Each structure stands twice: as C-alpha cells, then as structure tokens.
Write an enzyme that holds these catalytic residues in place. Structure first.
Site, PDB file in Angstrom:
ATOM      1  N   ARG A 177       0.869  -1.189   0.000  1.00 29.18           N
ATOM      2  CA  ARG A 177       0.000   0.000   0.000  1.00 29.18           C
ATOM      3  C   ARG A 177       0.906   1.240   0.000  1.00 29.18           C
ATOM      4  NH1 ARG A 177      -1.274  -3.733   3.584  1.00 29.18           N
ATOM      5  NH2 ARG A 177       0.160  -2.777   5.132  1.00 29.18           N
ATOM      6  N   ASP A 242       2.971  -8.536   6.704  1.00 25.89           N
ATOM      7  CA  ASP A 242       1.812  -7.844   6.133  1.00 25.89           C
ATOM      8  C   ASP A 242       0.607  -8.625   5.601  1.00 25.89           C
ATOM      9  OD1 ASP A 242       1.079  -5.504   3.554  1.00 25.89           O
ATOM     10  OD2 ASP A 242       0.720  -5.315   5.711  1.00 25.89           O
ATOM     11  N   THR A 243       0.240  -9.698   6.259  1.00 28.64           N
ATOM     12  CA  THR A 243      -0.919 -10.445   5.813  1.00 28.64           C
ATOM     13  C   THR A 243      -1.873 -10.630   7.025  1.00 28.64           C
ATOM     14  OG1 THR A 243       0.208 -12.550   6.222  1.00 28.64           O
ATOM     15  CG2 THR A 243       0.447 -11.589   4.006  1.00 28.64           C
ATOM     16  N   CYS A 348      -1.055 -20.132  -0.991  1.00 24.26           N
ATOM     17  CA  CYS A 348      -0.280 -19.669   0.151  1.00 24.26           C
ATOM     18  C   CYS A 348       0.375 -20.768   1.053  1.00 24.26           C
ATOM     19  CB  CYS A 348      -1.119 -18.768   1.064  1.00 24.26           C
ATOM     20  SG  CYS A 348      -0.097 -18.345   2.535  1.00 24.26           S
ATOM     21  N   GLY A 350       1.840 -20.063   3.890  1.00 20.58           N
ATOM     22  CA  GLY A 350       1.714 -19.623   5.269  1.00 20.58           C
ATOM     23  C   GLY A 350       0.313 -19.773   5.820  1.00 20.58           C
TER      24      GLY A 350
HETATM   25  C1  HEM Z   1      -4.330 -13.975   6.252  1.00 20.29           C
HETATM   26  C2  HEM Z   1      -3.115 -14.363   5.920  1.00 20.29           C
HETATM   27  C3  HEM Z   1      -2.613 -14.618   4.471  1.00 20.29           C
HETATM   28  C4  HEM Z   1      -3.240 -14.545   3.314  1.00 20.29           C
HETATM   29  C5  HEM Z   1      -4.701 -14.180   2.968  1.00 20.29           C
HETATM   30  C6  HEM Z   1      -2.302 -14.894   2.286  1.00 20.29           C
HETATM   31  C7  HEM Z   1      -2.622 -14.921   0.945  1.00 20.29           C
HETATM   32  C8  HEM Z   1      -1.725 -15.363  -0.029  1.00 20.29           C
HETATM   33  C9  HEM Z   1      -2.089 -15.387  -1.454  1.00 20.29           C
HETATM   34  C10 HEM Z   1      -3.476 -14.901  -1.958  1.00 20.29           C
HETATM   35  C11 HEM Z   1      -1.052 -15.891  -2.101  1.00 20.29           C
HETATM   36  C12 HEM Z   1      -0.950 -16.151  -3.637  1.00 20.29           C
HETATM   37  C13 HEM Z   1      -0.228 -15.089  -4.466  1.00 20.29           C
HETATM   38  C14 HEM Z   1      -0.166 -15.500  -5.996  1.00 20.29           C
HETATM   39  O1  HEM Z   1      -0.660 -16.535  -6.365  1.00 20.29           O
HETATM   40  O2  HEM Z   1       0.452 -14.603  -6.610  1.00 20.29           O
HETATM   41  C15 HEM Z   1       0.028 -16.187  -1.130  1.00 20.29           C
HETATM   42  C16 HEM Z   1       1.304 -16.738  -1.398  1.00 20.29           C
HETATM   43  C17 HEM Z   1       2.289 -16.928  -0.450  1.00 20.29           C
HETATM   44  N1  HEM Z   1       2.226 -16.651   0.922  1.00 20.29           N
HETATM   45 FE1  HEM Z   1       0.481 -16.186   1.938  1.00 20.29          FE
HETATM   46  N2  HEM Z   1      -1.052 -15.151   2.823  1.00 20.29           N
HETATM   47  C18 HEM Z   1      -1.207 -15.033   4.212  1.00 20.29           C
HETATM   48  C19 HEM Z   1      -0.229 -15.243   5.166  1.00 20.29           C
HETATM   49  C20 HEM Z   1       1.067 -15.669   4.925  1.00 20.29           C
HETATM   50  C21 HEM Z   1       2.088 -15.872   5.926  1.00 20.29           C
HETATM   51  C22 HEM Z   1       1.884 -15.658   7.447  1.00 20.29           C
HETATM   52  C23 HEM Z   1       3.195 -16.293   5.276  1.00 20.29           C
HETATM   53  C24 HEM Z   1       4.615 -16.691   5.819  1.00 20.29           C
HETATM   54  C25 HEM Z   1       5.272 -15.791   6.495  1.00 20.29           C
HETATM   55  C26 HEM Z   1       2.868 -16.361   3.848  1.00 20.29           C
HETATM   56  C27 HEM Z   1       3.747 -16.828   2.863  1.00 20.29           C
HETATM   57  C28 HEM Z   1       3.399 -16.961   1.526  1.00 20.29           C
HETATM   58  C29 HEM Z   1       4.299 -17.486   0.501  1.00 20.29           C
HETATM   59  C30 HEM Z   1       5.755 -17.955   0.838  1.00 20.29           C
HETATM   60  C31 HEM Z   1       3.622 -17.465  -0.686  1.00 20.29           C
HETATM   61  C32 HEM Z   1       4.104 -17.905  -2.113  1.00 20.29           C
HETATM   62  C33 HEM Z   1       3.731 -19.245  -2.656  1.00 20.29           C
HETATM   63  C34 HEM Z   1       4.256 -19.474  -4.153  1.00 20.29           C
HETATM   64  O3  HEM Z   1       4.397 -18.428  -4.796  1.00 20.29           O
HETATM   65  O4  HEM Z   1       4.383 -20.634  -4.396  1.00 20.29           O
HETATM   66  N3  HEM Z   1       1.594 -16.000   3.651  1.00 20.29           N
HETATM   67  N4  HEM Z   1      -0.408 -15.867   0.136  1.00 20.29           N
END
Ligand code: HEM
Length: 405
Positions: A177, A242-243, A348, A350
C-alpha cells in the site's frame, strides 16, 4: 491519471477501477472492490488506472486464470508494471515447473510440521498480550495486538531481532500500500539490502531459524544460491509482516460490531475454526495478478501478450455466484467458497500458520474479553492495495466484564 486505451481493448469494457484508492473505499475495502460485481459490470473489464490493465471480476474467471499458468504467468504479478517487472520474489515470480523445487524448500520453514511445533509458543504470546490489555478496558488493536502478535512470532521463527521491526514493516507496507515515499523497486532493494549480510552469516554459521534453513538448503537436490535464498527470504518476510496483521484487524473490527456473532463463539467455541474460514472468506484482502505470455482470447475477450491482468483473490468469495448473501457473515455457511489463500500452484504456504494465529487469537481473546466495542466516534478507515488493511482500530470495553485465565 488515466493511461490511454490501447487499440486492442474494447471501449465498452472500460471500467476505471483504481486498486490503490477505489472510489467507494469509505464504505469498507471489501465493499469498495465489490462495486466490480455491480449489476451491469462484465466478468472481464479494463481499467486505465495504474498504467492500464485487465481485472477479472468473477470467481469463475479468477480461478481459471490462476490455473492456466501457461497463459497467465507469475513472471510479472504486481501492478503497476514497474513494480511487477522489479518483483522477483521466490517462489511467487516463478511458474511451474521450476517453481515447485522452491515451494518445497519454503514449506520447510512455514509448513504444517513447523506450525505444530509453534503452537504453545503462539498461545503464550496471545495470552500474554491480551491479559496485559484486559484490565485497561481499551487498546488500539493494530498496534497493541494485530501487529505485535504475528510479527513477533515470525521474527522469532526467522531468528531476527525485534528492533528491526519498525524498519521492515515500513518497507513491507510500501510494497503493498505505497506511501509514495518509495517505489516497489526501492522498497525491494532495501529489503534485500537488509538480508544479504544476514544470509551470508547464517550460511557461514548455520542456525535452526528459517533464514539459515533456507540459505543452507537444497532444491531438486542442489545447493540454493545466496541470491535465490535472498529472493525467497524477502518473500517470507512479506508474508510474516503484512498479511495476518491486517486480517486480524478486519475480523476484530467485525466482532466489535457483532455481539450476536461473539455470543455464538463464546457459547460454542468449537465453532471457532468454522468462524475463521467464514471471516477469511468475508474479509478476504489480497489481490495480485498475472501477465499474458501470448495473444489469447479469454471469455470472448482478446488479450495480448504483455497485458497485465489483476485476479483479485479477494473477489471470488464475495462473488454472489459462489456464495449467496456474500456480504453476510454466516458462521454456519454450509459451503464457504473462497480463494483467500490464492489458487493454483501458488497456494499460500503460510496459510496453516495464518489459521493457527487466527483461531488462537479468536479463542484466547473471546475468553478474556468477550464483550467489547469500537471506541465512540471512531470513523474506522480502510486502505487498499496488493494487500488491503485497516488504518486504526480503537477498541474499548468495561474491565469488569472480563476474565483472566
Ligand atoms: C491472512 C493471511 C494470508 C493470506 C490471505 C495470504 C494470501 C496469499 C495469497 C493470496 C497468495 C498467492 C499469491 C499469488 O498466487 O500470486 C500467497 C502466497 C504466499 N504466501 Fe500467503 N497469505 C497469508 C499469510 C502468509 C504468511 C503468514 C506467510 C509466511 C510468512 C505467507 C507466505 C506466503 C508465501 C511464501 C507465498 C508464495 C507461494 C508461491 O508463490 O508458491 N503467507 N499468500
């Protein structure tokens, strides 16, 4: 303001949506993006805002696009184009097949087996924070709980000092943002600038933190480079800071305005995991996208190679064609259809850590402060971008209606 309409884009499909400041933002961010599902809006529209790009407005299209990586590549997933071209995080900027080898490594640092281990730790911190807030009958949720709780957990998982939190979170928010004080590129460079020495160090002397796990790791059986390790560690950082931080705020704002919904979870706490899925659906907050690898006709619309397309993960579950009364939070909703954690090969990693953090927050908070509300006169403000958030959340409550556990 608006970029001129490319020659191949039909004039009637134009709907100037600005993902960083949508027009109906004041009514809540989700409500603001939901204007794209208004009665006369098509499934695929083109906006002239932010350099110009497509936006799929319905779950059917968003899921299909996310599944077909041959046409919708992750190579350039951020808007504006500058930012997506500079965006090189791993594994998000990579498509199958070379993408998988890195997911496996990343899944070693935030995956389920690691989450289980983190359990007691997570509860201790949430219980610690809430009990300290309990007797005060007020708190500003974003700073007192939404940020410290998840961020401290990640900083600990990562083996990084908490003092660096102010700097890192600033860089993180600039990426999702933007303030305007820096480009995605500059913010990414600083993030990398921060990690480079740390990664070299963890490689020289290996620890048991996520950073050294990544940096001394292997992919497809081969050693990962310092650069790949940096690209992947920076993305892990984006996720940890930031999620969940923002999502906790949208949920708690809702609960502060929903005595009945709180009474349901107070009464049958076993409904908390269900309630978490429904909140994840309703307060979905991510929206990134893809870039067309070649000229392709999609749902009657001619896409050209190089065209960027926003695929709001947030939109699917608010789509009335997936869930009736989409804007109503129904903890009993029979089929909670959403793409909040994404869709396709990039699901995701995480998400498991994220649910734990949510369910625990909900469980430990409702048990100590079952009754609270939003501070009088507060005009809660939302903020939109790749990841949407809540500006401030001033909560108040009568201390005598609370319990220590
Ligand atoms: C409410 C919490 C969260 C939401 C809604 C969320 C949502 C998402 C979404 C929508 C994507 C897909 C992006 C794409 O396809 O371009 C993603 C990918 C990812 N997120 Fe989460 N996220 C959250 C929390 C976290 C946390 C806590 C972590 C770890 C610190 C994390 C690590 C990752 C990683 C490593 C990916 C990449 C997977 C790949 O590209 O194969 N996320 N996340």
């Amino acid at each position: 303001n608006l970029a001129p309409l490319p020659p191949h884009v039909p004039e009637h499909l134009v709907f100037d949506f600005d993902m960083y400041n949508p027009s109906n933002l004041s009514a809540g961010v989700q409500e603001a993006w939901a204007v794209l599902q208004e009665s006369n809006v098509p499934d695929l529209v083109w906006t002239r805002c932010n350099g110009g790009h497509w936006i799929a407005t319905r779950g059917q299209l968003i899921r299909e696009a996310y599944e077909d990586y041959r046409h919708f590549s992750s190579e350039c997933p951020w808007i504006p184009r500058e930012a997506g071209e500079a965006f090189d995080f791993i594994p998000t900027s990579m498509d199958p097949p070379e993408q998988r080898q890195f997911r496996a490594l990343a899944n070693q640092v935030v995956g389920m087996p690691v989450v289980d281990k983190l359990e007691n730790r997570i509860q201790e911190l949430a219980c610690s924070l809430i009990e300290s807030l309990r007797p005060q009958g007020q708190c500003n949720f974003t700073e007192d709980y939404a940020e410290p709780f998840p961020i401290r957990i990640f900083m600990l998982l990562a083996g990084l000092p908490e003092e660096d939190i102010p700097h890192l979170k600033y860089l993180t928010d600039q990426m999702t943002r933007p303030d305007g004080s820096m480009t995605f590129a500059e913010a990414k460079e600083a993030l990398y600038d921060y990690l480079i020495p740390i990664i070299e160090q963890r490689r020289q002397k290996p620890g048991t933190d996520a950073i050294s796990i990544v940096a001394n790791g292997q992919v497809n059986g081969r050693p990962i480079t310092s650069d790949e390790a940096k690209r992947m560690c920076g993305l892990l950082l984006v996720g940890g800071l930031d999620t969940v931080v923002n999502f906790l705020s949208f949920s708690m704002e809702f609960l502060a305005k929903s005595p009945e919904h709180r009474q349901e979870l107070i009464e049958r706490p076993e409904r908390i995991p269900a309630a978490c899925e429904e909140l994840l659906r309703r307060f979905s907050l991510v929206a990134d996208g893809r870039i067309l690898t070649s000229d392709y006709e999609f749902h009657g619309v001619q896409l050209k190679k190089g065209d960027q397309i926003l695929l709001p993960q947030m939109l699917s579950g608010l789509d009335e064609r997936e869930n009736a009364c989409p804007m109503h939070v129904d903890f009993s909703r029979q089929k909670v259809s959403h793409t909040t954690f994404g869709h396709g090969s990039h699901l995701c990693l995480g998400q498991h850590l994220a649910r734990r953090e949510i369910i625990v927050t909900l469980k430990e908070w409702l048990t100590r402060i079952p009754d609270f509300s939003i501070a009088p006169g507060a005009q809660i403000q939302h903020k939109s971008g790749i990841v949407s958030g809540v500006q401030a959340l001033p909560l108040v409550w009568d201390p005598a209606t609370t319990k220590a556990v």
